[model samples]
Target: MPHAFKPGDLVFAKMKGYPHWPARIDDIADGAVKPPPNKYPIFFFGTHETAFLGPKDLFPYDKSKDKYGKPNKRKGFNEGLWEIQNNPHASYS
Candidate 1:
Protein backbone atom coordinates (compact mmCIF):
# COMPACT_ATOMS: atom_id res chain seq x y z
CA MET A 1 0.00 0.00 0.00
CA PRO A 2 1.40 3.38 -0.95
CA HIS A 3 1.68 5.91 1.84
CA ALA A 4 -0.55 8.97 1.67
CA PHE A 5 2.14 10.95 3.48
CA LYS A 6 5.28 12.60 2.17
CA PRO A 7 8.60 13.76 3.56
CA GLY A 8 8.36 16.77 5.92
CA ASP A 9 4.66 16.12 6.52
CA LEU A 10 3.91 16.29 10.23
CA VAL A 11 1.94 13.27 11.48
CA PHE A 12 0.64 11.94 14.78
CA ALA A 13 1.34 8.29 15.72
CA LYS A 14 0.38 6.00 18.57
CA MET A 15 2.08 2.61 18.83
CA LYS A 16 0.68 -0.68 20.17
CA GLY A 17 0.51 0.50 23.78
CA TYR A 18 1.61 4.10 23.82
CA PRO A 19 -0.11 7.45 23.69
CA HIS A 20 -0.36 9.56 20.56
CA TRP A 21 2.97 11.03 19.46
CA PRO A 22 4.27 13.01 16.53
CA ALA A 23 6.00 11.29 13.57
CA ARG A 24 7.50 12.20 10.24
CA ILE A 25 7.66 10.34 6.94
CA ASP A 26 11.20 11.42 6.33
CA ASP A 27 12.60 8.06 5.17
CA ILE A 28 11.73 4.98 3.19
CA ALA A 29 12.97 1.47 3.97
CA ASP A 30 15.33 0.98 1.07
CA GLY A 31 12.74 0.52 -1.73
CA ALA A 32 9.85 -0.83 0.30
CA VAL A 33 7.34 1.92 -0.15
CA LYS A 34 4.18 -0.06 0.63
CA PRO A 35 4.62 -1.81 3.94
CA PRO A 36 1.55 -2.60 6.02
CA PRO A 37 0.40 0.37 8.03
CA ASN A 38 0.29 -1.53 11.31
CA LYS A 39 3.45 -3.40 10.37
CA TYR A 40 7.12 -2.38 10.51
CA PRO A 41 8.25 -3.53 7.06
CA ILE A 42 8.19 0.02 5.73
CA PHE A 43 10.37 2.69 7.38
CA PHE A 44 9.84 6.26 8.60
CA PHE A 45 11.80 8.54 10.89
CA GLY A 46 10.91 10.28 14.12
CA THR A 47 13.16 12.42 16.37
CA HIS A 48 15.39 9.41 16.95
CA GLU A 49 18.64 8.23 15.34
CA THR A 50 17.70 5.37 12.97
CA ALA A 51 14.61 5.48 10.81
CA PHE A 52 11.61 3.49 12.07
CA LEU A 53 8.05 2.56 11.13
CA GLY A 54 4.51 2.74 12.53
CA PRO A 55 0.91 1.86 11.72
CA LYS A 56 -1.90 3.81 10.04
CA ASP A 57 -2.86 5.03 13.46
CA LEU A 58 -1.26 8.39 12.79
CA PHE A 59 -2.06 11.39 10.66
CA PRO A 60 -1.09 14.96 9.75
CA TYR A 61 -1.23 17.68 12.40
CA ASP A 62 -0.80 21.44 12.52
CA LYS A 63 2.56 21.78 14.22
CA SER A 64 2.20 25.54 13.99
CA LYS A 65 0.11 25.47 17.16
CA ASP A 66 -0.98 23.53 20.25
CA LYS A 67 -3.39 20.62 20.73
CA TYR A 68 -6.23 23.12 20.52
CA GLY A 69 -4.81 24.27 17.19
CA LYS A 70 -3.69 27.54 18.72
CA PRO A 71 -0.57 29.43 17.68
CA ASN A 72 1.45 28.10 20.61
CA LYS A 73 3.91 25.30 21.47
CA ARG A 74 5.38 25.97 18.08
CA LYS A 75 8.95 26.04 19.33
CA GLY A 76 11.45 23.80 21.12
CA PHE A 77 10.63 20.34 22.49
CA ASN A 78 7.18 21.43 23.63
CA GLU A 79 6.38 22.33 20.11
CA GLY A 80 7.16 18.96 18.57
CA LEU A 81 7.51 17.08 21.81
CA TRP A 82 5.93 13.92 20.42
CA GLU A 83 8.94 13.30 18.21
CA ILE A 84 11.30 13.63 21.17
CA GLN A 85 9.14 11.36 23.31
CA ASN A 86 9.60 8.52 20.82
CA ASN A 87 13.31 8.99 20.55
CA PRO A 88 15.85 6.17 20.02
CA HIS A 89 15.23 2.79 21.50
CA ALA A 90 18.12 0.81 23.03
CA SER A 91 18.00 -1.84 20.29
CA TYR A 92 18.28 0.74 17.53
CA SER A 93 21.37 2.36 19.02
Candidate 2:
Protein backbone atom coordinates (compact mmCIF):
# COMPACT_ATOMS: atom_id res chain seq x y z
CA MET A 1 0.00 0.00 0.00
CA PRO A 2 1.72 3.15 -1.22
CA HIS A 3 -1.13 5.50 -0.52
CA ALA A 4 -2.00 5.89 -4.21
CA PHE A 5 -5.75 5.91 -3.40
CA LYS A 6 -7.57 9.02 -4.58
CA PRO A 7 -10.96 10.54 -3.82
CA GLY A 8 -12.91 8.23 -6.12
CA ASP A 9 -10.71 5.15 -6.35
CA LEU A 10 -12.82 2.00 -6.42
CA VAL A 11 -11.12 0.16 -3.62
CA PHE A 12 -12.41 -3.11 -2.19
CA ALA A 13 -11.48 -3.80 1.42
CA LYS A 14 -13.13 -5.84 4.16
CA MET A 15 -13.94 -3.93 7.31
CA LYS A 16 -11.29 -5.16 9.72
CA GLY A 17 -13.40 -5.20 12.92
CA TYR A 18 -16.61 -3.49 11.91
CA PRO A 19 -18.50 -6.58 10.89
CA HIS A 20 -21.46 -4.25 10.51
CA TRP A 21 -19.61 -2.12 8.01
CA PRO A 22 -19.06 -3.70 4.61
CA ALA A 23 -15.70 -3.69 2.93
CA ARG A 24 -15.87 -1.12 0.14
CA ILE A 25 -14.78 2.37 -0.82
CA ASP A 26 -17.93 4.43 -1.40
CA ASP A 27 -16.43 7.93 -1.30
CA ILE A 28 -13.34 9.53 0.12
CA ALA A 29 -13.33 12.50 2.44
CA ASP A 30 -11.71 15.53 0.81
CA GLY A 31 -8.96 15.61 3.44
CA ALA A 32 -9.95 12.88 5.87
CA VAL A 33 -7.27 10.96 7.66
CA LYS A 34 -7.14 7.19 7.62
CA PRO A 35 -7.72 5.56 10.97
CA PRO A 36 -4.84 3.70 12.54
CA PRO A 37 -4.86 -0.09 12.70
CA ASN A 38 -6.51 -0.86 16.00
CA LYS A 39 -9.53 -2.82 17.16
CA TYR A 40 -12.10 -0.31 18.28
CA PRO A 41 -13.34 -0.52 21.85
CA ILE A 42 -16.84 0.57 20.86
CA PHE A 43 -19.16 0.44 17.85
CA PHE A 44 -19.73 3.70 16.03
CA PHE A 45 -18.95 5.68 12.87
CA GLY A 46 -17.62 9.20 13.06
CA THR A 47 -14.52 11.35 13.37
CA HIS A 48 -13.86 10.89 17.12
CA GLU A 49 -15.90 7.74 17.66
CA THR A 50 -14.27 4.69 19.14
CA ALA A 51 -15.16 2.57 16.10
CA PHE A 52 -14.79 4.88 13.14
CA LEU A 53 -15.34 3.77 9.59
CA GLY A 54 -12.68 4.31 7.03
CA PRO A 55 -12.56 3.56 3.35
CA LYS A 56 -14.38 0.37 4.27
CA ASP A 57 -17.58 2.21 5.19
CA LEU A 58 -18.11 3.04 1.51
CA PHE A 59 -19.99 0.45 -0.54
CA PRO A 60 -23.03 0.23 -2.76
CA TYR A 61 -25.97 -1.11 -0.79
CA ASP A 62 -28.58 -2.21 -3.33
CA LYS A 63 -27.53 -0.29 -6.43
CA SER A 64 -24.94 -1.66 -8.81
CA LYS A 65 -22.30 0.25 -10.70
CA ASP A 66 -21.83 0.68 -14.42
CA LYS A 67 -19.43 -1.35 -16.52
CA TYR A 68 -16.72 1.10 -15.46
CA GLY A 69 -17.92 0.80 -11.82
CA LYS A 70 -19.37 4.24 -11.28
CA PRO A 71 -22.27 5.07 -8.97
CA ASN A 72 -25.23 5.06 -11.33
CA LYS A 73 -27.52 7.26 -9.24
CA ARG A 74 -27.84 9.73 -6.42
CA LYS A 75 -27.21 8.42 -2.88
CA GLY A 76 -28.43 9.25 0.58
CA PHE A 77 -27.39 8.11 4.03
CA ASN A 78 -29.60 5.68 5.86
CA GLU A 79 -29.66 3.95 9.23
CA GLY A 80 -26.45 2.33 10.45
CA LEU A 81 -24.20 1.25 7.54
CA TRP A 82 -27.14 1.04 5.19
CA GLU A 83 -27.85 3.64 2.49
CA ILE A 84 -30.21 4.20 -0.39
CA GLN A 85 -30.09 6.02 -3.71
CA ASN A 86 -32.53 8.81 -4.47
CA ASN A 87 -35.59 7.62 -6.33
CA PRO A 88 -37.22 10.14 -8.61
CA HIS A 89 -40.37 8.04 -9.09
CA ALA A 90 -39.84 5.73 -6.13
CA SER A 91 -38.48 2.94 -8.36
CA TYR A 92 -36.27 1.68 -5.54
CA SER A 93 -34.65 3.20 -2.55
Candidate 3:
Protein backbone atom coordinates (compact mmCIF):
# COMPACT_ATOMS: atom_id res chain seq x y z
CA MET A 1 0.00 0.00 0.00
CA PRO A 2 1.18 3.51 -0.78
CA HIS A 3 1.74 6.01 2.01
CA ALA A 4 -0.48 9.06 2.13
CA PHE A 5 1.83 12.04 2.34
CA LYS A 6 0.94 15.61 1.47
CA PRO A 7 2.89 18.83 1.13
CA GLY A 8 4.08 20.31 4.43
CA ASP A 9 4.31 16.95 6.21
CA LEU A 10 7.50 16.69 8.20
CA VAL A 11 9.39 13.42 7.75
CA PHE A 12 12.78 11.78 7.90
CA ALA A 13 14.17 11.11 4.42
CA LYS A 14 16.99 8.69 3.80
CA MET A 15 19.42 8.61 0.91
CA LYS A 16 21.61 5.72 -0.12
CA GLY A 17 24.60 5.23 2.21
CA TYR A 18 23.39 8.17 4.31
CA PRO A 19 21.52 8.49 7.59
CA HIS A 20 17.98 9.71 7.80
CA TRP A 21 17.62 13.49 7.64
CA PRO A 22 14.97 15.91 8.68
CA ALA A 23 12.85 17.17 5.81
CA ARG A 24 9.48 18.48 4.80
CA ILE A 25 7.39 17.36 1.91
CA ASP A 26 7.72 20.04 -0.72
CA ASP A 27 5.17 18.46 -2.99
CA ILE A 28 4.03 15.32 -4.72
CA ALA A 29 5.03 14.39 -8.26
CA ASP A 30 1.52 13.82 -9.47
CA GLY A 31 0.19 15.63 -12.52
CA ALA A 32 -1.29 15.12 -15.94
CA VAL A 33 2.06 13.72 -16.94
CA LYS A 34 3.14 11.53 -14.06
CA PRO A 35 6.69 11.95 -12.94
CA PRO A 36 8.16 9.01 -11.02
CA PRO A 37 6.20 6.33 -9.25
CA ASN A 38 4.88 7.90 -6.03
CA LYS A 39 7.87 10.14 -5.84
CA TYR A 40 7.82 12.99 -3.34
CA PRO A 41 9.74 16.23 -3.51
CA ILE A 42 11.28 16.92 -0.11
CA PHE A 43 13.30 19.82 1.29
CA PHE A 44 16.01 19.19 3.83
CA PHE A 45 16.16 21.28 6.95
CA GLY A 46 19.70 22.30 7.90
CA THR A 47 21.36 21.75 4.54
CA HIS A 48 18.43 23.23 2.67
CA GLU A 49 18.88 20.55 0.07
CA THR A 50 16.10 19.01 -2.00
CA ALA A 51 15.52 15.47 -3.27
CA PHE A 52 12.90 13.18 -4.71
CA LEU A 53 12.18 10.00 -2.78
CA GLY A 54 9.64 7.23 -2.52
CA PRO A 55 7.55 6.40 0.55
CA LYS A 56 9.67 3.41 1.44
CA ASP A 57 12.61 5.75 1.95
CA LEU A 58 10.81 8.04 4.34
CA PHE A 59 10.20 7.72 8.07
CA PRO A 60 8.23 9.52 10.71
CA TYR A 61 9.88 12.20 12.81
CA ASP A 62 10.57 11.33 16.43
CA LYS A 63 11.41 13.84 19.11
CA SER A 64 13.40 11.43 21.23
CA LYS A 65 15.95 10.24 18.73
CA ASP A 66 18.33 11.72 16.21
CA LYS A 67 18.51 10.62 12.61
CA TYR A 68 21.16 8.10 13.53
CA GLY A 69 19.09 6.58 16.34
CA LYS A 70 21.03 8.39 19.04
CA PRO A 71 19.35 10.15 21.91
CA ASN A 72 18.19 13.70 21.14
CA LYS A 73 17.78 15.08 24.64
CA ARG A 74 20.32 17.78 23.86
CA LYS A 75 20.32 20.00 20.77
CA GLY A 76 22.30 17.71 18.56
CA PHE A 77 19.93 18.10 15.65
CA ASN A 78 18.22 21.25 16.79
CA GLU A 79 19.32 23.31 13.84
CA GLY A 80 17.47 21.06 11.44
CA LEU A 81 14.38 20.74 13.61
CA TRP A 82 14.24 24.44 14.31
CA GLU A 83 14.64 25.28 10.67
CA ILE A 84 11.73 23.05 9.78
CA GLN A 85 9.46 24.54 12.45
CA ASN A 86 10.35 28.18 11.78
CA ASN A 87 10.79 27.99 8.04
CA PRO A 88 8.92 25.20 6.44
CA HIS A 89 9.25 26.70 2.98
CA ALA A 90 12.93 27.46 3.12
CA SER A 91 14.58 28.08 -0.23
CA TYR A 92 17.91 26.78 -1.38
CA SER A 93 20.81 28.99 -0.42
Candidate 4:
Protein backbone atom coordinates (compact mmCIF):
# COMPACT_ATOMS: atom_id res chain seq x y z
CA MET A 1 0.00 0.00 0.00
CA PRO A 2 1.07 3.58 -0.63
CA HIS A 3 1.94 5.82 2.34
CA ALA A 4 -0.50 8.70 2.64
CA PHE A 5 1.60 11.68 3.63
CA LYS A 6 1.58 15.39 2.91
CA PRO A 7 3.77 18.40 3.47
CA GLY A 8 4.51 19.38 7.10
CA ASP A 9 3.71 15.95 8.48
CA LEU A 10 6.29 14.70 10.94
CA VAL A 11 7.25 11.10 10.32
CA PHE A 12 9.89 8.45 10.96
CA ALA A 13 11.75 7.21 7.91
CA LYS A 14 15.04 5.52 7.14
CA MET A 15 17.81 7.64 5.68
CA LYS A 16 19.95 5.65 3.30
CA GLY A 17 18.90 2.64 5.42
CA TYR A 18 19.56 4.14 8.83
CA PRO A 19 16.99 2.79 11.29
CA HIS A 20 14.21 4.80 12.96
CA TRP A 21 15.14 8.44 12.56
CA PRO A 22 12.69 11.22 13.33
CA ALA A 23 11.93 12.93 10.05
CA ARG A 24 9.41 15.24 8.42
CA ILE A 25 7.91 15.70 4.99
CA ASP A 26 8.62 19.12 3.59
CA ASP A 27 7.18 18.92 0.05
CA ILE A 28 6.77 16.95 -3.14
CA ALA A 29 8.21 17.71 -6.53
CA ASP A 30 8.30 16.19 -9.96
CA GLY A 31 11.45 15.30 -11.89
CA ALA A 32 14.13 17.69 -10.83
CA VAL A 33 17.15 16.18 -12.52
CA LYS A 34 16.35 12.55 -13.35
CA PRO A 35 13.20 13.33 -15.35
CA PRO A 36 10.13 11.05 -15.87
CA PRO A 37 8.59 8.62 -13.35
CA ASN A 38 9.23 10.85 -10.39
CA LYS A 39 10.41 8.72 -7.48
CA TYR A 40 10.93 10.03 -3.97
CA PRO A 41 10.64 13.70 -5.05
CA ILE A 42 10.15 14.43 -1.38
CA PHE A 43 12.00 16.91 0.78
CA PHE A 44 12.48 15.92 4.40
CA PHE A 45 14.81 16.20 7.37
CA GLY A 46 16.13 14.21 10.31
CA THR A 47 16.36 15.27 13.95
CA HIS A 48 20.10 14.63 14.06
CA GLU A 49 21.14 14.63 10.44
CA THR A 50 21.26 17.53 8.04
CA ALA A 51 18.50 18.20 5.53
CA PHE A 52 17.60 15.04 3.62
CA LEU A 53 15.94 16.52 0.55
CA GLY A 54 14.59 13.15 -0.56
CA PRO A 55 13.81 9.62 0.53
CA LYS A 56 13.05 6.06 -0.54
CA ASP A 57 9.96 5.66 1.60
CA LEU A 58 7.71 8.03 3.49
CA PHE A 59 6.13 7.09 6.81
CA PRO A 60 4.07 9.83 8.41
CA TYR A 61 3.51 9.57 12.17
CA ASP A 62 2.48 13.00 13.41
CA LYS A 63 0.00 15.10 11.52
CA SER A 64 -0.17 18.39 13.42
CA LYS A 65 -3.18 19.80 11.70
CA ASP A 66 -6.35 21.53 12.81
CA LYS A 67 -10.02 21.00 11.81
CA TYR A 68 -9.53 22.40 8.33
CA GLY A 69 -6.38 20.40 7.56
CA LYS A 70 -4.20 23.34 8.41
CA PRO A 71 -0.96 23.07 10.31
CA ASN A 72 -1.31 23.45 14.08
CA LYS A 73 1.44 24.73 16.26
CA ARG A 74 1.59 24.54 20.06
CA LYS A 75 4.11 25.77 22.57
CA GLY A 76 3.75 22.94 25.07
CA PHE A 77 2.70 19.34 25.62
CA ASN A 78 -0.78 18.94 24.20
CA GLU A 79 -2.01 15.79 25.99
CA GLY A 80 -0.71 13.06 28.29
CA LEU A 81 -0.62 12.08 31.98
CA TRP A 82 1.36 10.15 34.54
CA GLU A 83 -0.71 7.00 35.03
CA ILE A 84 0.90 6.17 38.36
CA GLN A 85 2.40 4.12 35.67
CA ASN A 86 4.77 1.19 35.77
CA ASN A 87 5.62 -1.63 33.46
CA PRO A 88 4.28 -4.97 34.69
CA HIS A 89 7.52 -6.65 33.62
CA ALA A 90 9.55 -4.40 35.92
CA SER A 91 9.79 -4.83 39.69
CA TYR A 92 9.16 -1.48 41.29
CA SER A 93 7.12 -0.04 44.15
Candidate 5:
Protein backbone atom coordinates (compact mmCIF):
# COMPACT_ATOMS: atom_id res chain seq x y z
CA MET A 1 0.00 0.00 0.00
CA PRO A 2 1.07 3.55 -0.62
CA HIS A 3 2.24 5.44 2.45
CA ALA A 4 0.01 8.02 4.13
CA PHE A 5 2.87 10.57 4.09
CA LYS A 6 5.51 11.47 1.53
CA PRO A 7 9.03 12.84 1.59
CA GLY A 8 9.39 16.54 2.55
CA ASP A 9 6.11 16.60 4.41
CA LEU A 10 6.36 18.20 7.82
CA VAL A 11 4.96 16.02 10.60
CA PHE A 12 4.95 15.32 14.32
CA ALA A 13 6.48 12.06 15.49
CA LYS A 14 5.89 10.24 18.74
CA MET A 15 9.01 9.07 20.55
CA LYS A 16 9.47 7.10 23.70
CA GLY A 17 9.83 9.36 26.78
CA TYR A 18 9.09 12.43 24.71
CA PRO A 19 6.04 14.29 23.52
CA HIS A 20 5.07 14.35 19.86
CA TRP A 21 7.76 16.47 18.21
CA PRO A 22 8.11 18.30 14.91
CA ALA A 23 10.02 16.70 12.07
CA ARG A 24 10.27 16.47 8.33
CA ILE A 25 9.90 13.25 6.41
CA ASP A 26 13.27 12.47 4.88
CA ASP A 27 12.56 9.44 2.66
CA ILE A 28 10.80 6.14 2.44
CA ALA A 29 12.44 2.92 3.52
CA ASP A 30 13.74 0.74 0.69
CA GLY A 31 14.41 -3.00 0.26
CA ALA A 32 12.09 -5.97 0.52
CA VAL A 33 12.50 -6.42 4.26
CA LYS A 34 11.18 -3.35 6.05
CA PRO A 35 12.34 -2.45 9.54
CA PRO A 36 10.05 -3.60 12.37
CA PRO A 37 8.10 -0.49 13.47
CA ASN A 38 10.56 2.01 12.05
CA LYS A 39 9.55 2.33 8.42
CA TYR A 40 9.56 6.06 7.68
CA PRO A 41 12.77 8.03 7.99
CA ILE A 42 12.40 11.50 9.47
CA PHE A 43 14.58 14.29 10.81
CA PHE A 44 13.54 16.33 13.82
CA PHE A 45 13.67 20.09 13.97
CA GLY A 46 15.86 22.13 16.37
CA THR A 47 18.04 19.19 17.44
CA HIS A 48 18.27 17.87 13.88
CA GLU A 49 17.95 14.33 15.17
CA THR A 50 16.88 11.57 12.80
CA ALA A 51 14.83 8.42 13.34
CA PHE A 52 12.58 5.86 11.69
CA LEU A 53 9.00 5.64 12.84
CA GLY A 54 5.81 3.97 11.69
CA PRO A 55 3.15 5.94 9.82
CA LYS A 56 0.75 5.50 12.71
CA ASP A 57 3.18 7.36 14.94
CA LEU A 58 3.31 10.44 12.76
CA PHE A 59 0.88 13.36 12.58
CA PRO A 60 0.66 15.96 9.87
CA TYR A 61 2.26 19.33 10.70
CA ASP A 62 1.31 22.71 9.29
CA LYS A 63 4.07 25.28 9.34
CA SER A 64 1.82 27.87 7.80
CA LYS A 65 0.03 28.60 11.04
CA ASP A 66 0.73 28.93 14.74
CA LYS A 67 -1.16 28.86 18.04
CA TYR A 68 -1.60 32.62 18.01
CA GLY A 69 -2.69 32.87 14.38
CA LYS A 70 0.80 33.85 13.36
CA PRO A 71 2.44 32.52 10.23
CA ASN A 72 5.51 30.34 10.02
CA LYS A 73 6.08 30.01 13.73
CA ARG A 74 7.13 26.77 15.37
CA LYS A 75 4.36 25.20 17.39
CA GLY A 76 4.72 25.04 21.14
CA PHE A 77 4.21 22.00 23.32
CA ASN A 78 0.62 22.81 24.27
CA GLU A 79 -0.38 23.24 20.67
CA GLY A 80 1.17 19.92 19.72
CA LEU A 81 -0.46 18.26 22.69
CA TRP A 82 -3.83 19.63 21.64
CA GLU A 83 -3.43 18.35 18.12
CA ILE A 84 -2.51 14.87 19.26
CA GLN A 85 -5.35 14.76 21.75
CA ASN A 86 -7.80 15.83 19.08
CA ASN A 87 -6.53 13.45 16.45
CA PRO A 88 -8.71 10.37 16.27
CA HIS A 89 -6.11 8.29 14.47
CA ALA A 90 -3.24 9.21 16.82
CA SER A 91 -1.49 6.27 18.47
CA TYR A 92 0.37 6.39 21.77
CA SER A 93 2.64 3.95 23.60
Candidate 6:
Protein backbone atom coordinates (compact mmCIF):
# COMPACT_ATOMS: atom_id res chain seq x y z
CA MET A 1 0.00 0.00 0.00
CA PRO A 2 1.08 3.55 -0.67
CA HIS A 3 1.85 5.81 2.25
CA ALA A 4 -0.60 8.42 3.51
CA PHE A 5 2.05 11.07 3.98
CA LYS A 6 3.91 13.51 1.79
CA PRO A 7 7.41 14.94 2.04
CA GLY A 8 6.52 18.32 3.49
CA ASP A 9 3.53 17.57 5.65
CA LEU A 10 3.69 17.61 9.43
CA VAL A 11 2.72 14.27 10.88
CA PHE A 12 2.87 12.04 13.91
CA ALA A 13 3.37 8.33 14.27
CA LYS A 14 2.93 5.70 16.94
CA MET A 15 4.06 2.15 16.54
CA LYS A 16 2.32 -0.98 17.77
CA GLY A 17 3.03 -0.19 21.40
CA TYR A 18 4.76 3.19 21.45
CA PRO A 19 3.58 6.72 22.08
CA HIS A 20 2.90 9.07 19.22
CA TRP A 21 5.65 11.44 18.25
CA PRO A 22 5.67 14.54 16.09
CA ALA A 23 7.65 14.59 12.87
CA ARG A 24 8.14 16.02 9.42
CA ILE A 25 9.22 14.10 6.38
CA ASP A 26 12.51 15.14 4.85
CA ASP A 27 12.83 12.57 2.13
CA ILE A 28 11.99 9.08 1.05
CA ALA A 29 14.53 6.67 -0.31
CA ASP A 30 14.49 3.15 -1.58
CA GLY A 31 15.02 0.37 0.94
CA ALA A 32 18.73 0.31 0.06
CA VAL A 33 19.67 3.12 2.44
CA LYS A 34 22.60 2.00 4.55
CA PRO A 35 23.25 2.91 8.14
CA PRO A 36 26.53 4.26 9.48
CA PRO A 37 27.67 1.02 11.16
CA ASN A 38 28.17 -0.74 7.80
CA LYS A 39 26.75 -3.83 9.43
CA TYR A 40 23.23 -3.71 8.03
CA PRO A 41 21.18 -1.30 6.00
CA ILE A 42 19.24 0.95 8.41
CA PHE A 43 15.76 -0.02 9.32
CA PHE A 44 13.47 2.59 10.84
CA PHE A 45 14.65 1.61 14.30
CA GLY A 46 17.84 -0.12 13.19
CA THR A 47 16.62 -3.47 14.37
CA HIS A 48 18.96 -5.79 12.47
CA GLU A 49 22.58 -5.97 11.43
CA THR A 50 21.97 -7.15 7.85
CA ALA A 51 18.29 -6.69 7.24
CA PHE A 52 16.97 -4.17 4.71
CA LEU A 53 13.45 -3.45 3.61
CA GLY A 54 12.05 -1.87 0.43
CA PRO A 55 13.17 1.64 1.40
CA LYS A 56 9.57 2.51 1.79
CA ASP A 57 10.53 3.90 5.15
CA LEU A 58 10.42 7.67 5.41
CA PHE A 59 13.43 9.65 6.61
CA PRO A 60 12.09 12.44 8.79
CA TYR A 61 13.47 15.75 10.05
CA ASP A 62 16.71 15.51 8.15
CA LYS A 63 18.79 18.49 9.15
CA SER A 64 15.70 20.16 10.53
CA LYS A 65 14.91 21.22 14.07
CA ASP A 66 11.95 20.13 16.13
CA LYS A 67 10.86 20.60 19.71
CA TYR A 68 11.65 17.98 22.28
CA GLY A 69 11.53 17.27 26.01
CA LYS A 70 9.30 20.09 27.23
CA PRO A 71 8.17 21.10 23.73
CA ASN A 72 9.95 24.39 24.21
CA LYS A 73 12.98 23.18 22.29
CA ARG A 74 14.61 22.77 25.65
CA LYS A 75 16.19 19.44 26.57
CA GLY A 76 15.92 16.82 23.83
CA PHE A 77 17.80 14.00 22.16
CA ASN A 78 19.86 16.13 19.88
CA GLU A 79 18.14 18.42 17.37
CA GLY A 80 16.99 15.67 15.06
CA LEU A 81 15.56 12.99 17.25
CA TRP A 82 13.04 10.66 15.57
CA GLU A 83 9.73 11.41 17.20
CA ILE A 84 7.37 9.42 15.02
CA GLN A 85 7.59 6.10 13.31
CA ASN A 86 5.89 2.89 12.15
CA ASN A 87 9.18 1.46 11.07
CA PRO A 88 9.32 -1.88 9.34
CA HIS A 89 10.93 -4.85 10.97
CA ALA A 90 14.42 -5.76 9.81
CA SER A 91 13.99 -9.48 10.24
CA TYR A 92 14.81 -11.34 7.07
CA SER A 93 11.98 -13.41 5.69
Which candidate comes out best when scored by lDDT? 3
Candidate 5 C-alpha lDDT tens digits along 40-63: 776665445568788877777653
Question: In TM-score terms, which candidate is top?
Answer: 3
The TM-scores of all predictions, comma-separated, are 0.42, 0.21, 0.63, 0.34, 0.53, 0.29
lDDT of 3 by residue, 12-43 (tens): 78889656777878854457233366798777
Model 6 residue 67 distance off true place after TM-score fit, in angstroms: 16
Number of clashes recorded per candidate: 1, 1, 0, 0, 0, 3
Per-residue lDDT for 51 in model 3? 82
lDDT per residue, candidate 4, 1-93, as tens digits?
A: 545555555544544644434344444337534413434333222122224434445455433122212222322111100111112112111
74 in model 6: Cα distance from truth in Å?
A: 15
- Alpha carbon lDDT of each predicted model: 0.43, 0.29, 0.67, 0.34, 0.58, 0.32
- Which structure is stronger by lDDT: 2 or 4? 4
TM for candidate 3 is 0.63
Least accurate 10 contiguous residues by lDDT in model 3: 67-76
TM-score of 4: 0.34
Candidate 1: where are CA atoms >4 Å away?
A: 1-3, 29-55, 63-65, 68-93
Tens-digit lDDT string for candidate 1 (1-93): 445555555555545554355545554447655545544331223334223455456555564225622222333323345433445221231
Indicate the residue-level lDDT of 19 in model 5: 61
* Residue 1, model 5, lDDT: 44
Better of 1 and 4 by TM-score: 1
Order of all candidates by lDDT, from best down to worst?
A: 3, 5, 1, 4, 6, 2
Model 2, residue 36: distance off in Å is 7.4
Model 6, CA-based lDDT: 0.32
Candidate 1 backbone collisions, by pair: 37-55
Candidate 6's TM-score: 0.29
